[PDB]
Amino acid sequence: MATMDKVFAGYAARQKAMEAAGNPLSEGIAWVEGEMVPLHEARIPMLDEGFMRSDLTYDVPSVWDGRFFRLDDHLSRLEASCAKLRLKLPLPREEVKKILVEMVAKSGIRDAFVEIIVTRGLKGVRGSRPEEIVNRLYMLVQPYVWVMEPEVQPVGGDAVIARTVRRVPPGSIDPTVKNLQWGDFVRGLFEASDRGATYPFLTDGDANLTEGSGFNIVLVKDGVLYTPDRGVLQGVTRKSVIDVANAKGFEVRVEYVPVEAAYHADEIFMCTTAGGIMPIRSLDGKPVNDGKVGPITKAIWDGYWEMHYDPAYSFEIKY
Amino acid sequence: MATMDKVFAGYAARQKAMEAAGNPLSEGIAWVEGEMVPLHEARIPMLDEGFMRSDLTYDVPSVWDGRFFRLDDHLSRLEASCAKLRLKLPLPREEVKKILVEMVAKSGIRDAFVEIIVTRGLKGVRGSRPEEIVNRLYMLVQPYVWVMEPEVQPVGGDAVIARTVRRVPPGSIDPTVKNLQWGDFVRGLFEASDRGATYPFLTDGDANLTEGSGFNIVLVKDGVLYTPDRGVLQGVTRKSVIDVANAKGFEVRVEYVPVEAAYHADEIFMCTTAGGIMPIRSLDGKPVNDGKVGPITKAIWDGYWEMHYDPAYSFEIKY
Ligand SMILES: *Cc1c(COP(=O)(O)O)cnc(C)c1O
Ligand SMILES: *Cc1c(COP(=O)(O)O)cnc(C)c1O
Ligand code: NA
Ligand code: NA
Ligand code: NA
Ligand code: NA
């Protein structure tokens, strides 16, 4: 369990140093209407009908150890999300990239959660002519967010297959469009908490796994990785999982994963930008296999963080 | 078609008078953090995790001809919406009532769209302890909004049964909780527009009608009114429709309404606070019956606006 120490110890050191620098901007910076403002003072107009009706999409790249991770993948997914929503990125993609690097640089944050939001704008879809709709852009940079805290990743967390809620189906809301309409996920969070666990796994209502509240799901069984194809966000972390798995000779099947498979899996882990590779030790109050972080999961964990220093997948920021 | 003239002519006169008064506050007033501010300057903090994840509920009473319509019904539905979301109205209900009356009074608006929003607050559900969650309140007053403009209600609008999208199911998001997660409704709006119509009727994906983008649906067939029970908001307008129908001896069945019934209906109309009683002359590009506003619909229209002057359902505002 060495590489986790090196990763987490490095993170700790950089957090210790950022508090020492006392920079007020290291609490976060936002981009709103062409202007960079401190995070705790960034505000959205109530007249942004888009934002009001959550008629928007968003995406969250990260910065780790001063390096932006797969930014172009996130920008490309955001553009595809916009197109599916009949939205348009209000600024050229390369300018968004420049602003984001500047914001991270000016903030001094070495490990950052970065968020880009495109909304319909001030005039909503209902009863407005196409000429009158002007999409709006919001961006943000802030310290890295953990869906699983570093102290838990060596042991793994507690999940449940949710039984009081199921995933919004693609015929209502396209799950490949990263969105903030979290009604089902929030029910899943409360259900997990009510049942004495932390992470909800949502079904599709048809006996298959989909995803959870802010993460994709992966099963390991007899040396093969399984993760749902339909009904889920096509995560960039999931993508990196496939890259590491291929590089290490593990097969990954992106396909229909029945709920039943979760109860027989050798290993389970979640993956997401806000936290990385997140092992699950128990499901529905029962141990996953031996209740430990599995070997294939640790290989995926190691490779995922290793690739944060591959220039094919990252670039360094000048602060 | 007299009573529509009296209603719309009165509305016109009051709009003519509000423009004459030139009051800048007659464009709207908002309540944000204890302070009343002009609408075009009201802003929401990006750190409102609730609002960000649309982890909120809301409700929209109206003011017509200087009288608040069924405010207590809306406040009661909002409280029930909060309870289902494990939210709490941050101020006592009677104080919210007082603020809203004051806001309408100070604004001078005689015909108003009024909106109350309760969000999870600055600390979201995920990874926060129950002690750290403080729900936040937002309110707004602005000129009356029409989902169907007065000029169209005498003739009726053009609807379609949506075929590219279906209603979010209650097992994902409780439709009796008025909410702003409009992903499916926005797809329905674009589909309607693509097909040359205006109003989408969403199915439940199981061959029954539910509701539309901001309105309940009612069918009239052989002297009986039909409106879906499950999968929809229990509208206050729908409630008033039942009151008028009962008073006039018409039966209303709140039950499963198959999609097939829409294609054989004698009359169809939508109902919502933002516009009232809204007849539909065509469905899927075909006439509804004779393509005219039907008689039972006009009786419902007349009674609905009549009851805006019944003290059992309204009170007058002192401006
Ligand atoms: C963000 C998120 C994921 C993970 O996607 P990444 O691109 O790896 O961050 C998966 N599912 C949902 C619902 C998410 O919000
Ligand atoms: C607001 C709305 C209605 C109508 O409800 P009222 O209380 O009559 O205003 C119906 N369905 C949806 C989805 C709505 O947003
Ligand atoms: Na996106
Ligand atoms: Na998946
Ligand atoms: Na409500
Ligand atoms: Na109904």
XYZ file of C-alpha atoms and ligand atoms in Angstrom:
672
model
C 0.000 0.000 0.000
C 2.980 2.208 -0.796
C 1.778 4.232 -3.772
C -1.276 5.428 -1.824
C 1.035 6.810 0.857
C 3.140 8.658 -1.719
C 0.023 10.097 -3.363
C -1.735 11.039 -0.129
C 1.427 12.227 1.614
C 2.151 14.488 -1.340
C -1.396 15.819 -1.224
C -1.088 16.464 2.516
C 2.175 18.352 2.031
C 0.669 20.587 -0.646
C -2.351 21.303 1.580
C -0.017 22.153 4.468
C 1.845 24.544 2.162
C -1.300 26.222 0.815
C -2.508 27.036 4.330
C 0.943 28.434 5.125
C 0.827 30.759 2.104
C -2.423 32.166 3.522
C -3.476 33.353 0.057
C -7.176 34.337 0.252
C -7.650 33.365 -3.406
C -6.674 29.780 -2.525
C -10.247 29.348 -1.251
C -11.407 29.580 -4.883
C -11.988 31.797 -7.912
C -15.053 32.108 -10.141
C -15.691 33.443 -13.652
C -19.153 34.927 -14.118
C -19.648 37.716 -16.672
C -16.159 38.112 -18.060
C -14.715 38.897 -14.625
C -12.757 36.725 -12.208
C -14.122 37.039 -8.676
C -13.496 35.249 -5.372
C -15.545 32.099 -4.944
C -17.447 33.139 -1.804
C -18.619 36.265 -3.666
C -19.693 34.689 -6.981
C -23.441 34.944 -7.602
C -25.849 33.857 -10.342
C -28.737 36.087 -11.501
C -32.195 34.766 -10.648
C -33.151 35.883 -14.176
C -30.904 33.172 -15.608
C -33.905 31.065 -16.624
C -31.509 28.348 -17.761
C -29.940 28.021 -14.319
C -33.371 28.346 -12.681
C -34.863 25.419 -14.642
C -31.468 23.637 -14.406
C -31.589 23.975 -18.217
C -27.828 23.584 -18.445
C -24.937 21.160 -18.646
C -21.571 21.181 -16.904
C -18.283 19.358 -16.592
C -15.580 19.019 -13.966
C -11.905 18.645 -14.899
C -9.341 18.432 -12.127
C -5.840 19.642 -11.331
C -3.566 17.324 -9.361
C -0.045 18.165 -8.189
C -0.130 21.248 -10.404
C -1.109 19.284 -13.540
C -4.449 19.526 -15.363
C -5.832 16.024 -15.947
C -7.446 15.177 -19.299
C -8.794 18.701 -19.748
C -9.393 18.183 -23.467
C -11.545 15.106 -22.783
C -13.722 17.158 -20.431
C -13.937 20.096 -22.839
C -14.903 17.684 -25.627
C -17.585 16.036 -23.497
C -18.914 19.477 -22.550
C -19.198 20.491 -26.202
C -21.045 17.244 -26.954
C -23.286 17.876 -23.939
C -24.059 21.367 -25.263
C -24.931 20.011 -28.703
C -27.340 17.452 -27.267
C -29.061 20.257 -25.331
C -29.022 22.656 -28.312
C -26.601 24.802 -26.305
C -23.416 26.447 -27.593
C -20.231 27.060 -25.627
C -20.364 30.883 -25.389
C -16.590 31.311 -25.743
C -14.202 29.472 -28.084
C -12.899 26.280 -26.542
C -9.280 27.469 -26.546
C -10.242 30.649 -24.690
C -12.073 28.633 -22.035
C -8.891 26.582 -21.661
C -6.842 29.776 -21.268
C -9.197 31.261 -18.675
C -9.215 28.043 -16.645
C -5.416 27.798 -16.583
C -5.248 31.462 -15.566
C -7.795 30.894 -12.794
C -5.925 27.887 -11.411
C -2.642 29.791 -11.692
C -3.964 32.928 -9.996
C -5.548 30.817 -7.249
C -2.358 28.980 -6.322
C -4.342 25.758 -5.864
C -2.244 22.726 -6.773
C -5.061 20.185 -6.275
C -8.258 21.632 -7.680
C -11.865 20.806 -8.461
C -12.699 22.792 -11.601
C -16.246 23.319 -12.841
C -17.580 24.658 -16.139
C -21.310 25.390 -16.504
C -23.260 26.414 -19.613
C -26.882 27.523 -19.120
C -29.682 28.430 -21.517
C -29.395 32.044 -20.391
C -31.749 34.820 -19.360
C -34.528 33.905 -21.813
C -35.813 30.366 -21.383
C -36.912 27.882 -24.005
C -40.637 28.253 -23.325
C -42.177 31.030 -25.404
C -38.897 32.540 -26.633
C -37.854 32.749 -30.278
C -34.508 31.175 -31.257
C -33.029 34.628 -31.972
C -33.581 35.755 -28.362
C -31.683 32.911 -26.603
C -28.126 33.766 -25.508
C -26.370 30.982 -23.600
C -24.302 31.947 -20.561
C -21.059 30.574 -19.124
C -19.980 30.094 -15.511
C -16.689 28.648 -14.274
C -15.136 27.905 -10.909
C -11.910 26.697 -9.301
C -11.668 25.440 -5.730
C -9.784 22.884 -3.625
C -10.040 19.236 -4.666
C -13.259 17.551 -3.532
C -13.344 13.974 -2.227
C -16.384 11.745 -2.692
C -14.266 9.310 -0.648
C -11.784 10.874 1.770
C -8.131 9.762 1.460
C -8.335 8.038 4.845
C -11.114 5.731 3.591
C -9.696 4.690 0.212
C -7.159 2.218 1.732
C -10.041 0.276 3.355
C -13.071 1.011 1.160
C -16.555 2.366 1.767
C -20.096 1.101 2.329
C -22.578 1.016 -0.552
C -26.140 -0.162 -1.064
C -28.287 -1.026 -4.050
C -30.965 1.620 -3.623
C -34.482 0.269 -3.226
C -36.480 3.498 -2.665
C -35.351 5.234 -5.877
C -34.131 4.311 -9.360
C -32.064 6.155 -11.962
C -33.772 8.748 -14.166
C -34.174 6.858 -17.496
C -32.495 8.122 -20.689
C -35.917 8.642 -22.263
C -36.549 11.395 -19.710
C -33.034 12.857 -19.298
C -29.994 11.788 -21.320
C -27.484 10.523 -18.704
C -24.592 11.083 -21.127
C -25.345 14.818 -20.717
C -23.610 15.749 -17.456
C -26.296 17.651 -15.569
C -27.240 18.997 -12.150
C -30.783 17.546 -11.935
C -29.931 15.373 -8.947
C -33.400 14.507 -7.618
C -32.820 10.758 -7.789
C -29.230 10.977 -6.549
C -30.297 13.017 -3.513
C -32.947 10.425 -2.644
C -30.169 7.853 -2.990
C -27.926 9.735 -0.573
C -30.624 9.902 2.102
C -31.544 6.244 1.608
C -27.902 5.176 1.991
C -27.614 7.278 5.149
C -30.887 5.846 6.492
C -29.581 2.305 5.922
C -26.254 2.923 7.644
C -24.128 3.201 4.499
C -22.690 6.003 2.374
C -22.824 5.309 -1.370
C -26.041 4.612 -3.308
C -25.942 2.390 -6.386
C -28.990 3.163 -8.530
C -30.679 0.561 -10.688
C -32.391 1.276 -13.984
C -35.659 -0.086 -12.595
C -35.170 -3.105 -14.853
C -32.759 -5.170 -12.715
C -29.493 -3.625 -14.021
C -26.909 -1.368 -12.391
C -26.407 2.170 -13.653
C -24.346 4.659 -11.613
C -24.317 6.413 -8.264
C -24.538 9.939 -6.864
C -21.579 11.391 -8.715
C -19.637 8.279 -9.710
C -19.533 5.401 -12.144
C -19.616 1.816 -10.865
C -17.212 -0.999 -11.731
C -17.416 -4.693 -10.890
C -14.498 -7.125 -10.944
C -15.296 -10.808 -11.396
C -12.854 -13.611 -12.277
C -10.255 -11.184 -13.625
C -12.608 -9.163 -15.862
C -13.928 -5.647 -15.230
C -17.623 -4.872 -15.791
C -19.253 -1.420 -15.932
C -22.667 -0.345 -17.259
C -22.875 0.977 -20.812
C -26.401 2.427 -20.940
C -28.021 4.800 -18.486
C -24.857 6.401 -17.092
C -22.408 9.196 -17.670
C -19.451 8.035 -19.780
C -16.957 9.178 -17.188
C -13.451 10.372 -17.932
C -12.299 8.425 -14.876
C -14.048 5.365 -16.290
C -12.173 6.067 -19.539
C -8.887 6.190 -17.631
C -9.847 2.933 -15.899
C -10.176 1.322 -19.326
C -6.777 2.715 -20.343
C -5.032 1.361 -17.238
C -6.865 -1.970 -17.535
C -5.916 -2.411 -21.181
C -2.308 -1.440 -20.418
C -2.189 -4.069 -17.651
C -3.865 -6.774 -19.730
C -7.264 -6.688 -18.003
C -10.397 -6.855 -20.129
C -13.170 -4.300 -19.488
C -16.695 -5.005 -20.709
C -18.905 -1.924 -21.079
C -22.269 -3.633 -21.225
C -25.433 -4.417 -19.317
C -24.449 -5.341 -15.754
C -27.269 -7.091 -13.847
C -27.835 -6.123 -10.225
C -27.287 -9.768 -9.308
C -23.631 -9.518 -10.363
C -22.932 -6.952 -7.640
C -23.664 -9.587 -4.971
C -21.161 -12.064 -6.426
C -18.367 -9.644 -7.415
C -14.771 -10.309 -6.374
C -14.210 -6.548 -6.103
C -16.221 -3.351 -6.438
C -15.085 0.226 -6.826
C -16.479 3.571 -7.892
C -14.671 6.041 -10.127
C -15.057 9.801 -10.484
C -12.963 12.924 -10.986
C -13.812 14.171 -7.468
C -11.853 11.497 -5.637
C -10.424 9.128 -8.248
C -10.620 5.349 -7.691
C -12.844 4.511 -4.713
C -13.026 0.915 -3.431
C -16.166 -0.553 -1.849
C -15.701 -3.032 1.005
C -19.392 -3.741 1.684
C -22.701 -3.839 -0.175
C -26.068 -3.861 1.581
C -24.273 -4.349 4.891
C -22.396 -7.460 3.693
C -18.693 -7.881 2.769
C -17.662 -7.637 -0.864
C -15.688 -10.880 -1.153
C -13.115 -10.669 1.661
C -14.097 -7.126 2.621
C -10.721 -5.724 1.536
C -9.521 -3.551 -1.307
C -8.918 -6.060 -4.053
C -5.779 -6.537 -6.109
C -7.205 -5.546 -9.488
C -8.693 -2.452 -7.835
C -5.296 -1.471 -6.391
C -3.678 -1.955 -9.806
C -6.346 0.372 -11.245
C -5.778 2.848 -8.404
C -2.002 2.877 -8.954
C -2.230 3.245 -12.722
C -4.831 6.008 -12.482
C -2.617 8.264 -10.411
C 0.525 7.319 -12.348
C -1.136 8.631 -15.530
C -1.538 12.059 -13.874
C 2.152 12.536 -14.805
C 1.875 11.243 -18.378
C 2.028 14.211 -20.799
C -0.348 12.374 -23.130
C -3.008 12.906 -20.425
C -1.845 16.009 -18.552
C 0.056 19.275 -18.713
C 1.752 21.315 -16.003
C 0.474 24.722 -14.940
C 2.771 27.714 -14.466
C 1.687 29.420 -11.241
C -67.370 34.675 -25.346
C -68.232 37.625 -23.123
C -66.564 36.737 -19.832
C -63.192 36.313 -21.566
C -63.476 39.866 -22.882
C -64.263 41.231 -19.417
C -61.341 39.316 -17.905
C -58.847 40.165 -20.643
C -60.052 43.745 -21.067
C -59.628 44.281 -17.338
C -56.142 42.800 -17.496
C -55.260 45.057 -20.433
C -56.483 48.137 -18.574
C -54.399 47.310 -15.507
C -51.318 46.741 -17.691
C -51.933 50.079 -19.421
C -52.134 51.731 -15.995
C -48.980 50.076 -14.643
C -46.921 51.335 -17.584
C -48.370 54.812 -17.030
C -47.304 54.802 -13.368
C -43.747 54.142 -14.580
C -42.829 52.627 -11.205
C -39.447 50.870 -11.615
C -40.409 48.343 -8.925
C -43.324 47.205 -11.113
C -40.771 45.153 -13.074
C -40.435 42.914 -9.998
C -39.102 42.528 -6.461
C -37.068 39.704 -4.928
C -36.363 38.533 -1.372
C -32.946 36.942 -0.936
C -31.211 37.171 2.454
C -33.747 39.095 4.484
C -33.656 42.050 2.083
C -36.075 43.099 -0.643
C -34.228 43.959 -3.851
C -35.262 44.755 -7.430
C -35.768 41.684 -9.579
C -33.122 42.456 -12.218
C -30.545 42.751 -9.409
C -31.406 39.614 -7.399
C -28.618 37.021 -7.425
C -28.079 33.556 -5.944
C -24.714 32.488 -4.464
C -22.908 29.786 -6.430
C -22.118 28.264 -3.015
C -25.806 27.466 -2.554
C -25.192 23.758 -3.147
C -28.939 23.186 -2.920
C -29.670 25.552 -5.798
C -26.655 24.214 -7.716
C -27.856 20.585 -7.570
C -31.463 21.848 -7.949
C -31.847 20.279 -4.478
C -34.890 22.422 -3.765
C -38.633 22.769 -4.139
C -40.756 25.776 -5.043
C -44.299 26.977 -5.527
C -46.014 29.722 -7.488
C -49.111 31.504 -6.165
C -50.615 34.299 -8.223
C -52.225 37.695 -7.744
C -55.053 38.664 -10.087
C -56.851 42.017 -10.098
C -55.161 42.846 -6.801
C -56.315 39.615 -5.102
C -54.052 36.749 -4.006
C -55.459 33.455 -5.303
C -55.453 30.387 -3.034
C -52.228 31.435 -1.320
C -52.812 29.073 1.602
C -53.146 26.092 -0.758
C -49.777 26.945 -2.306
C -48.122 27.514 1.072
C -49.516 24.176 2.269
C -48.259 22.355 -0.821
C -44.847 23.985 -0.364
C -44.638 22.789 3.237
C -45.570 19.269 2.116
C -42.968 19.514 -0.656
C -40.344 20.532 1.916
C -41.231 17.606 4.171
C -40.899 15.104 1.335
C -37.441 16.530 0.569
C -36.432 16.685 4.257
C -36.416 20.475 3.893
C -37.888 23.000 6.335
C -39.448 26.346 5.465
C -36.786 28.682 6.931
C -39.321 31.273 8.121
C -42.702 30.692 9.792
C -45.476 30.302 7.259
C -47.332 33.408 8.451
C -44.194 35.526 8.061
C -43.704 34.276 4.502
C -47.309 35.298 3.844
C -46.625 38.760 5.293
C -43.455 39.260 3.249
C -45.193 38.199 0.035
C -48.114 40.584 0.564
C -45.635 43.368 1.332
C -43.646 42.576 -1.817
C -46.740 42.601 -4.025
C -47.930 45.796 -2.333
C -44.587 47.579 -2.667
C -44.324 46.476 -6.304
C -47.692 47.878 -7.351
C -48.287 44.819 -9.547
C -51.982 43.961 -9.714
C -51.513 40.784 -11.794
C -48.483 38.928 -10.503
C -46.540 35.703 -10.843
C -45.195 34.961 -7.359
C -42.488 32.390 -6.685
C -41.234 30.855 -3.440
C -38.098 28.677 -3.476
C -36.568 26.630 -0.649
C -33.105 25.133 -1.250
C -30.902 22.771 0.744
C -28.523 25.651 1.415
C -24.787 26.240 1.316
C -23.812 22.763 2.553
C -25.131 19.961 0.368
C -26.445 16.564 1.363
C -23.361 14.635 0.251
C -20.785 14.379 3.028
C -22.405 16.911 5.376
C -23.694 16.105 8.856
C -27.350 16.923 9.625
C -26.282 19.673 12.057
C -24.477 21.598 9.291
C -27.417 21.907 6.831
C -29.246 25.258 6.900
C -32.014 25.577 4.310
C -32.331 28.876 2.450
C -35.340 30.821 1.172
C -35.783 32.847 -2.012
C -38.911 34.691 -3.140
C -39.920 36.760 -6.138
C -42.776 38.870 -7.496
C -43.129 39.856 -11.142
C -45.805 40.484 -13.781
C -48.214 37.641 -14.536
C -46.771 35.001 -16.867
C -48.830 33.356 -19.617
C -48.168 29.794 -20.755
C -50.945 30.623 -23.244
C -51.283 34.282 -24.215
C -54.736 35.880 -23.771
C -55.106 36.204 -27.544
C -54.830 32.416 -27.976
C -57.168 31.218 -25.217
C -60.371 32.068 -27.186
C -59.253 29.711 -29.998
C -56.960 27.183 -28.300
C -53.415 25.976 -28.866
C -51.564 23.124 -30.567
C -50.336 20.155 -28.532
C -48.609 16.865 -29.255
C -48.158 13.598 -27.412
C -44.382 13.626 -27.100
C -42.636 10.663 -28.691
C -38.947 11.553 -28.112
C -39.211 11.922 -24.317
C -41.345 10.618 -21.451
C -42.111 11.944 -17.972
C -39.559 11.409 -15.198
C -41.119 8.518 -13.191
C -42.093 8.972 -9.522
C -39.542 6.331 -8.536
C -36.799 8.719 -9.666
C -38.323 12.106 -8.736
C -41.614 12.564 -6.883
C -43.801 14.615 -9.281
C -45.983 15.785 -6.379
C -42.896 17.735 -5.216
C -42.952 20.893 -7.346
C -39.394 21.113 -8.646
C -37.194 22.826 -11.218
C -35.528 19.705 -12.698
C -37.038 20.279 -16.129
C -34.836 18.056 -18.312
C -37.763 16.090 -19.723
C -40.010 19.141 -20.058
C -37.333 21.024 -22.009
C -36.950 18.091 -24.407
C -40.737 18.210 -24.739
C -40.690 21.905 -25.613
C -38.124 21.416 -28.377
C -39.956 18.371 -29.738
C -43.245 20.297 -29.884
C -41.494 23.164 -31.667
C -39.806 20.735 -34.078
C -43.197 19.196 -34.914
C -44.902 22.530 -35.542
C -46.843 22.703 -32.272
C -46.431 24.405 -28.901
C -47.474 22.232 -25.950
C -45.942 18.826 -25.148
C -48.041 16.176 -23.418
C -45.700 13.683 -21.750
C -46.578 10.032 -21.322
C -45.460 7.871 -18.426
C -43.722 5.508 -20.847
C -46.481 2.996 -20.118
C -49.211 4.284 -22.472
C -50.812 6.795 -20.044
C -50.911 10.592 -19.998
C -49.174 12.507 -17.227
C -48.663 16.281 -17.534
C -46.916 18.852 -19.686
C -44.174 21.467 -19.387
C -45.712 23.476 -16.578
C -49.362 22.427 -16.735
C -51.780 19.670 -15.860
C -53.851 18.010 -18.591
C -57.618 17.504 -18.643
C -59.752 15.504 -21.060
C -63.494 15.930 -21.561
C -65.423 12.970 -22.947
C -69.213 12.490 -22.975
C -69.754 15.076 -20.240
C -67.113 13.755 -17.810
C -63.716 15.296 -17.041
C -60.613 13.080 -16.879
C -57.174 14.035 -15.519
C -54.218 11.846 -14.500
C -53.842 10.931 -10.835
C -50.338 9.427 -10.721
C -47.144 10.888 -12.114
C -48.141 14.565 -12.048
C -48.189 17.618 -9.852
C -51.496 17.926 -7.977
C -52.088 21.416 -9.287
C -53.993 24.121 -7.465
C -55.560 25.059 -10.800
C -56.561 21.422 -11.239
C -58.057 21.640 -7.735
C -60.025 24.730 -8.755
C -61.156 22.891 -11.896
C -62.604 20.175 -9.667
C -64.350 22.809 -7.535
C -65.949 24.519 -10.542
C -66.863 21.159 -12.097
C -68.511 19.897 -8.922
C -70.362 23.205 -8.501
C -71.678 22.919 -12.075
C -72.620 19.250 -11.760
C -69.768 17.828 -13.856
C -67.982 14.715 -12.638
C -64.158 14.720 -12.570
C -62.276 11.425 -12.456
C -58.699 11.672 -11.165
C -57.400 8.352 -12.411
C -55.262 6.638 -15.010
C -55.938 8.311 -18.366
C -54.688 6.238 -21.331
C -52.975 8.061 -24.180
C -55.612 6.621 -26.505
C -58.305 8.714 -24.801
C -56.626 11.941 -25.922
C -57.342 11.047 -29.567
C -61.067 10.549 -28.934
C -61.689 13.419 -26.482
C -64.560 15.851 -27.034
C -62.439 18.620 -25.498
C -58.925 19.084 -24.150
C -57.466 21.829 -22.013
C -54.438 22.464 -19.845
C -54.536 24.160 -16.457
C -51.839 26.027 -14.543
C -51.398 29.077 -12.332
C -49.315 30.837 -15.019
C -52.173 31.322 -17.455
C -55.254 29.668 -15.958
C -57.501 27.495 -18.162
C -55.888 26.844 -21.552
C -57.893 25.114 -24.308
C -56.283 22.856 -26.921
C -57.736 22.929 -30.441
C -55.388 20.367 -32.024
C -53.379 17.299 -31.042
C -50.618 15.845 -33.206
C -51.645 18.204 -35.998
C -55.284 17.023 -35.988
C -58.430 18.800 -34.689
C -59.684 18.014 -31.207
C -63.315 17.221 -32.035
C -64.539 20.296 -33.938
C -61.310 22.223 -33.384
C -63.046 24.817 -31.194
C -63.007 25.662 -27.516
C -65.603 23.319 -26.113
C -68.582 24.185 -23.949
C -67.505 22.344 -20.805
C -64.078 23.973 -21.152
C -65.645 27.449 -21.362
C -67.766 26.705 -18.287
C -64.549 25.717 -16.477
C -62.812 28.855 -17.764
C -65.646 31.119 -16.581
C -65.925 29.516 -13.153
C -62.162 29.583 -12.611
C -61.911 33.331 -13.020
C -65.179 33.969 -11.168
C -63.684 32.255 -8.097
C -60.827 34.804 -8.100
C -63.374 37.112 -6.397
C -64.676 34.558 -3.889
C -63.272 35.383 -0.419
C -63.177 31.665 0.376
C -60.392 31.436 -2.246
C -58.852 34.916 -2.297
C -58.114 38.079 -0.357
C -57.511 41.639 -1.517
C -54.138 43.334 -1.168
C -53.753 46.873 0.165
C -51.249 48.626 -2.103
C -19.302 13.138 -12.504
C -20.067 11.844 -12.398
C -19.516 10.643 -12.829
C -18.020 10.496 -13.053
O -17.611 11.090 -14.256
P -16.056 11.592 -14.431
O -15.935 12.144 -15.824
O -15.164 10.399 -14.226
O -15.817 12.618 -13.366
C -20.333 9.549 -13.064
N -21.687 9.635 -12.881
C -22.250 10.811 -12.441
C -23.741 10.857 -12.237
C -21.442 11.918 -12.203
O -21.967 13.095 -11.761
C -46.912 24.352 -12.063
C -47.188 23.110 -12.871
C -48.461 22.554 -12.926
C -49.689 23.352 -12.522
O -49.815 23.447 -11.129
P -50.650 24.699 -10.468
O -50.628 24.494 -8.978
O -52.050 24.655 -11.015
O -49.953 25.951 -10.902
C -48.629 21.248 -13.356
N -47.552 20.488 -13.724
C -46.285 21.025 -13.690
C -45.130 20.160 -14.121
C -46.101 22.335 -13.260
O -44.861 22.898 -13.220
Na -20.605 17.799 -20.089
Na -20.435 2.625 -16.271
Na -44.272 22.947 -3.577
Na -53.706 15.557 -13.639
